[PDB]
Amino acid sequence: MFIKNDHAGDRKRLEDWRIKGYDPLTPPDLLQHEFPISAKGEENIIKARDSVCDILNGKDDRLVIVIGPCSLHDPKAAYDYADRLAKISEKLSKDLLIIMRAYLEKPRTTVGWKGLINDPDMNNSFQINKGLRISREMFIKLVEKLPIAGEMLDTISPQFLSDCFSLGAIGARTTESQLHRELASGLSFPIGFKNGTDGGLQVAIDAMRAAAHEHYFLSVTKPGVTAIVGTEGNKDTFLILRGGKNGTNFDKESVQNTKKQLEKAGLTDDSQKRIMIDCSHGNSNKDFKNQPKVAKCIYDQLTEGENSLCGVMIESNINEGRQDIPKEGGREGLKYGCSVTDACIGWESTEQVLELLAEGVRNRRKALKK
Amino acid sequence: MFIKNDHAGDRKRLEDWRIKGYDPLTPPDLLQHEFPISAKGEENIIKARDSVCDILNGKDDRLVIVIGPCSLHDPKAAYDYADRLAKISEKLSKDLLIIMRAYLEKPRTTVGWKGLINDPDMNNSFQINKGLRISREMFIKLVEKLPIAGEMLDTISPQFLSDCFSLGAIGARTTESQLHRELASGLSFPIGFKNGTDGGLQVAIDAMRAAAHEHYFLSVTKPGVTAIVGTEGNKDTFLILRGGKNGTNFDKESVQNTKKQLEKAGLTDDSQKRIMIDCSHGNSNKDFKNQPKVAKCIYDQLTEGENSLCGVMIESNINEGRQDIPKEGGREGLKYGCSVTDACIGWESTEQVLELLAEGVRNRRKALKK
């Protein structure tokens, strides 16, 4: 702490006796001035957002693919993965609309590395200020290469990193939080809510419904100070089928149920597409090798003409599997292109699945006579 | 809106085209100045906190009863009720500690009054600065009458009102939120989380495990600027049973099952008491009539000497049931002392209930020969 609470632990102060101190923080202004976005990255982002919103509204028959490392921990690897992916995306420019999984943390119940933002040297130093710096810079570099997608959590943290997202996602732990639903209703891109830890759809229905309305809440402004914010709202929201405590909900029947309750909520019609399926995480029962297989199911629903499906989430890294960051050595003790956060499928798995989906969208074209 | 995004709609800019613009805000330093907490309120607040920290470590053999409106919405009415409860609160004082349920906003997914802070004019005018004024004014009056407790909904707001809380809960929906755990660890009083909307008990155990720890995050400081905060961690933590979509857990079995899971967690031992019961919300199935009978169940388990219990929650009001705030009417014409959120028990029932539980505490005393 730069400022230190000299009175920590005294239980005769009304407040703050549990507070160690404070460290200076950088307002989003200064960073947004320091790390601006190039017009090319700007253009990437905007046209990306719109096209997504097109696919949502029934306007485009393409399919959205949010794929990438579950968390990002090493930048050079991010440029490698982004250029390799911009290659294959170049190849599929007319079918998939692929967007990268730029995630800077895995939220956890158990102690660990707290994400790229919190622990920048990965040794629990917590000079988060740097974390942000380098982390935002990586985006002013990536957005020139391809569109990226973050997951929301710290109402405060996006202020620094929202202008780079062309889409966002919301986690199960946080999907019931009216905080976050407000936050989406402010955000400047489409947002996908993950269905509850037990599987529940209702939480995600409720989040979309919430996020569409206009909201007022306390938030943090670009000059690092507090004000009251008004959100026009965000109607271009969707649902991400995910969890396993109740089991896997990727099965076709599950998708139909999602659709029946979505038209039971006025949240979709036959012409709009609001369903994203997330394989990594809950449906894979926590094994990377299970990721390819579900792909099999989604493709198949496309082949029969499933038009509700808007997009698909994929856990993916240059090298497959996962690894434990060493007690000692930090980032230098990690294998190159290998996920710290979740087990990913290897680049090879990833390209074979992409060819499969490129074809599935074509077959949906042929059976619908589209 | 004071400031107005003049670009709200041009989905052509990097960011902020879903933000209406913002409204100025009284910083917490200032609101901690305009309304200070008199020395008597200071005394009540801290004596209560230490009392609850005793009950939590088994040093006290009395019972924490958090009782009050589902939502506090009429400050005259609240003063009247805090009067009454404080009067009988020392009637039973030897028996248990009575903390009043000072909540400001009831979490939802639907349209309606977003609490006293967001819309305290009750007209969807949203004059939030005043909301805060009013509300802190309220608080500093109430801590002179009896200590209080509130529901931590968001993490900017308690900068304005924390020092009136002797004690706080984390709403069922936000328990899984990393954010509310990090916030929890700094607060200078006891926190008890509510179990997940399924009824699941792992969320709350994990939250207790996290909040014990020391965390560093981004938070708002008393002057009104964001900063990096380190917390000591709050070890003064517990669990609240409240119900779910499944498993209403107000029974002897369910409590013992829970105690066993907390023991398996290394959070408590047979001397400590880490379990609080909510008798509204799920357990009551939105039926105020079923609250007293749940008191009865409790009273029975205390007659049996159940020593892991630290408290009970209770949504009580001057007049029972609830009433519908007319959306096309004002708060001008509304029944006095009738909670406008979840259905409450009457004043007479409240006398009754409280007497009955006092008896229960006496009975547990005799069971272990204390």
Author numbering:
A (entry chain B), B (entry chain A): 1 to 370
Source paper text:
To further investigate the mechanism of the D154N mutation in relieving the inhibition by L-Phe, we determined the crystal structure of Aro3 at 3.3 Å. The Aro3 crystals contain one dimer per asymmetric unit with each monomer exhibiting a canonical (β/α)8 TIM-barrel fold common to other Type Iα DAHPS enzymes. Next, we used the AutoDockTools-1.5.6 program to model the complex structures. During the simulations, L-Phe was harbored in a cavity formed by helices α3 and α4, β-sheets of β6a/β6b and their adjacent loops, and the N-terminus of the second subunit of the dimer. Strikingly, the distance between the carboxyl oxygen (OE1) of Q159 and the nitrogen (N) of L-Phe was centered around 2.8 Å in the wild-type complex, while a much longer distance (centered around 5.3 Å and 5.8 Å) was found in the Aro3D154N mutant complex. Taken together, the hydrogen bonding between L-Phe with the two key residues (Q159 and K222) of Aro3 were weakened by introducing the D154N mutation. Although the D154 of Aro3 and its counterparts of other type Iα DHAPS are located outside the inhibitor binding cavity, substitution by Asn weakened interactions between Q159/K222 and the enzyme inhibitor. The Aro3 crystal structure along with the molecular dynamics simulations analysis suggests that the D154N mutation distant from the inhibitor binding cavity may reduce the binding affinity of L-Phe. Among them, the wild-type enzyme demonstrated high binding affinity for L-Phe with a Kd of 31.4 μM. The mutant Aro3D154N exhibited weaker interactions and higher Kd value, 10-fold of the wild-type Kd.
